[PDB]
């Protein structure tokens, strides 16, 4: 017995909320296959630029590497924040306050990019929470029909009753398909965002090391 | 009716039912006391916060707080701050003053948060165990139904009607006692959280007044 | 068919009404204020000095909270006029901006715990509604010698439906609360993006001042 035939065996409210089930499942798969290739491309780009900037030993060398990074290149954005703290703090004697403000801005931007990675994940945790429970409510309306039907028929047997059995099995096998991959995809997205933030914090600490060594050389030349 | 089915009881159904309704009365009484208590305290605290938001030194805060009343907790925080002024007379470390005073404010705001928390220990227990004692009254009512069957020694649905129905009534009244206790407990949990947050705002204002006065005094010292 | 069924039905229905009412009010509230915070942050991101930030914030409107942050910063400028300790000014200003960000995060939190308590208690009044619906599905059963369940199969039924009145009123609101636990989690960090930057705009403009007082 086919899926749409069992859909014909039901009535209006479980029809509407099973439409809600399959739409939540479709948008779950869509957010997954979007953010997966997005994470993959950004990991490859960040690993590329990290293996580029691992050879830099001065901040001027870092800008010379960063001259062709690109518009949305996050490491170039970090070097732009570092250059901004260079240019704003021109004429000061406290290089340590410059380093503190620079490390604080870099922690701020690493937190900002880590927040930028997690846009659809709120809806993912939402769906992973609600999917057994909207499956339960869809179960409830899809099941409040066998009472009525065998009150109508006075017949307690096979295909009178058994499409209701297969109807409940379908109505939260869809809940299973909506529930388990949502939780698993959200946990592995949390994993990949944590790894991305770890790598980005490593890159930001590298930028801090570059600017800190260059300011230490400048202060030693001043002494 | 309710009282007719109460007349259908044995002694233990009567005892668990009076336990349910007396716990309900205790719950509502605790609610209607602490509700107007929290409204008065939050009203006074927000009013005194809006008064003290314009103070700029600590003696200005004494000038504002001269008329706040005896149990004014903001005035009590200023008493703690004045105590830490008087205990620090002859010292040279303003940082240690701020450490000691902020630590006392942490402990006093914790103490007032414990002062808010009275009776909630009753509320959590009542809202927890009330479905369980509703189930216990259900079990004893089902036992009374089988006692009635053993008295009648027959198989009939009119035999099993009143005892099963009264066990069902005990199941209902257990949840009647169950729900509002949990309601009021979560209500008071949120309200005490907001109260402690506003008290921390007031203590922050006290710390800011103290820190401005100590740092301007140290700047005037040089 | 009894007063308790009707009372718990209207209680569940009014609870769902209050739920969706707070939902659709605070939804456009969060949307408008988050969009305003985002665009004002994108405006304020181009400030290089503190009076430049005052010139940027001169047209933000009175209820712009970042303007209130700049009022807080100007207040810590104007209260501490005549001092030599910029570090205590920065510590107090950091503490004030911490408490203002926390305060705005508290003002966003109002009405959310309403939905949390509703989505927590809605299962309990829902299960009690199923209970008294079962009492009415019953006692007439054993009063009228009902052995064939076919005359009480619509009688049984339908108590399940009280669960149906529960769950939609019960379950997603907490999730909505959890949604509102995360959007505010997106809000307070975003707000937290701005105010300490207000520190940094001060932190350079004090350090560029005293170093100007150095030589």
């Amino acid at each position: 017995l086919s899926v749409w035939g069992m859909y014909q065996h039901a009535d209006i409210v479980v029809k509407c909320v099973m439409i809600g089930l399959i739409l939540a499942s479709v948008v779950t798969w869509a957010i997954f296959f979007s953010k997966s290739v997005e994470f993959f491309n950004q990991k490859r780009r960040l690993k590329r630029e990290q293996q580029l900037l691992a050879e830099a030993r001065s901040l001027n060398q870092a800008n010379d590497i960063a001259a062709d990074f690109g518009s949305k290149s996050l490491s170039l954005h970090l070097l732009n924040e570092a250059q901004n703290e260079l240019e704003l703090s021109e004429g000061s004697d406290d290089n340590e306050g410059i380093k503190e403000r620079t490390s604080f801005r870099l922690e701020r931007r690493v937190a900002a990019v880590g927040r930028q990675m997690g846009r659809g994940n709120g809806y993912l945790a939402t769906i992973g929470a609600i999917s057994p429970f909207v499956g339960l409510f869809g179960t409830v309306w899809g099941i409040m029909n066998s009472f009525i039907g065998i009150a109508q028929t006075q017949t307690t047997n096979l295909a009178v009753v058994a499409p209701g059995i297969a109807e409940a099995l379908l109505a939260t096998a869809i809940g299973l398909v909506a529930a388990i991959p949502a939780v698993v995809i959200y946990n592995v997205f949390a994993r990949q965002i944590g790894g991305f933030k770890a790598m980005l914090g490593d890159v930001a600490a590298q930028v801090l090391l570059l600017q800190s060594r260059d300011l230490d050389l400048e202060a030693s030349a001043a002494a | 009716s309710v009282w007719g089915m109460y007349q259908h009881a044995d002694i233990v159904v009567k005892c668990v039912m009076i336990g349910l309704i007396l716990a309900s009365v205790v719950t509502w009484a605790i609610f209607f006391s602490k509700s107007v208590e929290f409204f008065n305290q939050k009203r006074r605290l927000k009013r005194e916060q809006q008064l003290l938001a314009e103070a700029r030194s600590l003696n200005q805060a004494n000038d504002i707080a001269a008329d706040f009343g005896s149990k004014s907790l903001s005035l009590h925080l200023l008493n703690e701050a004045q105590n830490e002024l008087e205990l620090s007379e002859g010292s040279d470390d303003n940082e240690g003053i701020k450490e000691r005073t902020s630590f006392r404010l942490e402990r006093r705001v914790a103490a007032v948060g414990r002062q808010m928390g009275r009776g909630n220990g009753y509320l959590a227990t009542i809202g927890a165990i009330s479905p369980f004692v509703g189930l216990f009254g259900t079990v004893w009512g089902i036992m009374n139904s089988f006692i009635g069957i053993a008295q009648t020694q027959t198989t009939n649905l009119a035999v099993v009607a009143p005892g099963i129905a009264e066990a069902l009534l005990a199941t209902a009244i257990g949840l009647v006692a169950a729900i509002p206790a949990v309601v009021i407990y979560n209500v008071f949990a949120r309200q005490i959280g907001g109260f402690k947050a506003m008290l921390g705002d007031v203590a922050a204002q006290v710390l800011l007044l103290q820190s401005r006065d100590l740092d301007l005094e140290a700047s005037a010292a040089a | 068919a009894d007063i308790v069924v009707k009372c718990v039905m209207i209680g569940l229905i009014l609870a769902s009404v209050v739920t969706w009412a707070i939902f659709f009010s605070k939804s456009v509230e969060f949307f408008n204020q988050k969009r305003r915070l985002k665009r004002e942050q994108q405006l304020l991101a181009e400030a290089r000095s503190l009076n430049q930030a005052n010139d940027i914030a001169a047209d933000f409107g009175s209820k712009s909270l970042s303007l209130h942050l700049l009022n807080e910063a100007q207040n810590e400028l104007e209260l501490s006029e005549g001092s030599d300790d910029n570090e205590g000014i920065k510590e107090r200003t950091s503490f004030r901006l911490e408490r203002r960000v926390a305060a705005v995060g508290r003002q966003m939190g109002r009405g959310n715990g309403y939905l949390a308590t509703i989505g927590a208690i809605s299962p309990f009044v829902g299960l009690f509604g199923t209970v008294w619906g079962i009492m009415n599905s019953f006692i007439g059963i054993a009063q009228t010698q009902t052995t064939n369940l076919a005359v009480v199969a619509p009688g049984i039924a339908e108590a399940l439906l009280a669960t149906a009145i529960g769950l939609v009123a019960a379950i997603p609101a907490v999730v909505i609360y959890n949604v509102f636990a995360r959007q505010i989690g997106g809000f307070k960090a975003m707000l937290g993006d701005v105010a300490a930057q207000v520190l940094l705009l001060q932190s350079r403009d004090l350090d560029l001042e005293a170093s100007a007082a150095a030589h």
């Binding site: - | 479905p131 099993v160 099963i164 | 989505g119 299962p123 299960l127 209970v131 019953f138 108590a159």
Partner: peptide, 22 residues
């Protein structure tokens, strides 16, 4: 997690269902 509060409800459904075949 505010999800496992369905258990008492499950118990209530079950001990409805003990009475219905009787």
């Amino acid at each position: 997690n505010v999800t496992p509060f369905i258990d008492v409800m499950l118990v209530l459904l079950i001990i409805f269902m003990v009475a219905a075949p009787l």
